[PDB]
Design a protein around this ligand. Structure first.
Ligand SMILES: Cc1ccnc(N)c1
Length: 168
């Protein structure tokens, strides 16, 4: 139903909210929820771990089956799997892990995947354990994505930094 509420306009197609993406997915019933995945689709922490836990491991079992056919995703790549109880679809996107020296230029590639979907509930890509500056990631999102993005940021302090950087 894509019943988004309380999202702040950043650009005509990028909105942001201080919220837990799992709780958003349950309220919003989005067509697409984006996971911040790794190449092995192993949902062991951060957004991925949260989304998987909210599916009671339905997402991890489906992810294992895909990886059985595909082998690992490429950095900057994506796949579309079931959203289970969270969404119609989950778009698993692999941003670069800058801690492992993966090129930050692949962040644009990662966000380009969003352009295959009209409306998405998403996190910022390559933030947290992937080591990219989250405000940088928001700039790449805004520059790259032309479809409608509703970004969920869990931490209030980071949310206020992002909004201050973007609008002040
Ligand atoms: C634990 C956790 C980390 C990041 N985003 C969330 N929604 C939840």
């Amino acid at each position: 139903v894509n019943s988004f509420s309380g999202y702040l306009k950043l650009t005509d197609n990028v909105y942001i909210k201080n919220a837990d993406i799992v709780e958003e997915a349950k309220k919003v019933k989005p067509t697409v929820v984006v996971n911040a995945a790794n190449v092995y689709l192993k949902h062991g922490g951060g957004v991925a771990g949260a989304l998987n836990k909210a599916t009671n491991n339905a997402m991890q079992v489906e992810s294992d089956d895909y990886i059985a056919t595909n082998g690992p995703l490429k950095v900057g790549g994506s796949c579309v799997l079931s959203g289970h109880n969270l969404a119609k679809h989950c778009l698993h996107v692999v941003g670069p892990n800058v801690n492992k020296g993966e090129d930050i230029q692949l962040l644009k590639s990662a966000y380009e995947n969003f352009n295959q979907h009209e409306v998405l509930l998403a996190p910022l890509l390559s933030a947290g354990i992937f080591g990219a500056d989250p405000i940088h990631s928001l700039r790449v999102c805004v520059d790259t994505v032309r479809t409608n993005v509703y970004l969920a940021v869990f931490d209030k302090n980071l949310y206020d930094k992002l909004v201050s950087s973007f609008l002040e």
